Amino acid sequence: SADQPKEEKKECYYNLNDASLCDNVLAPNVTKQECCCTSGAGWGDNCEIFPCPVLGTAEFTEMCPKGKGFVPAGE
């Protein structure tokens, strides 16, 4: 539950954040799975974001088991 992307909605980040500088600028609040699966850059709580996705890698593959382009914007 806690040791895996699940039941946890936050602000998406297409730009970045570096989990310390917070760099959203146009990003809806959703579940890392959706935001990242869209192909963003980071998902978290302003400044506390996780570099996502990574495409063809562990991270993404997790937040997006279907394919890149599920949610709006990055669809």
Curated annotation (Swiss-Prot):
Transmembrane segments: none annotated. It comes from the Eukaryota. Disulfide bonds join 12-35, 22-47, 36-52, 37-64. Residues 7-74 are annotated as: 8-Cys3 region. Residues 10-64 form the TB domain. The 8-Cys3 region in the third TB domain mediates the interchain disulfide bond interaction with the Latency-associated peptide chain (LAP) regulatory chain of TGFB1. It is linked to Cutis laxa, autosomal recessive, 2E: A form of cutis laxa, a disorder characterized by an excessive congenital skin wrinkling, a large fontanelle with delayed closure, a typical facial appearance with downslanting palpebral fissures, and a general connective tissue weakness. ARCL2E patients present with cutis laxa, inguinal hernia, craniofacial dysmorphology, variable heart defects, and prominent skeletal features including craniosynostosis, short stature, brachydactyly, and syndactyly. This is Latent-transforming growth factor beta-binding protein 1. It comes from Homo sapiens (Human). The chain holds residues 1340 to 1412 of 1721 of the full protein.
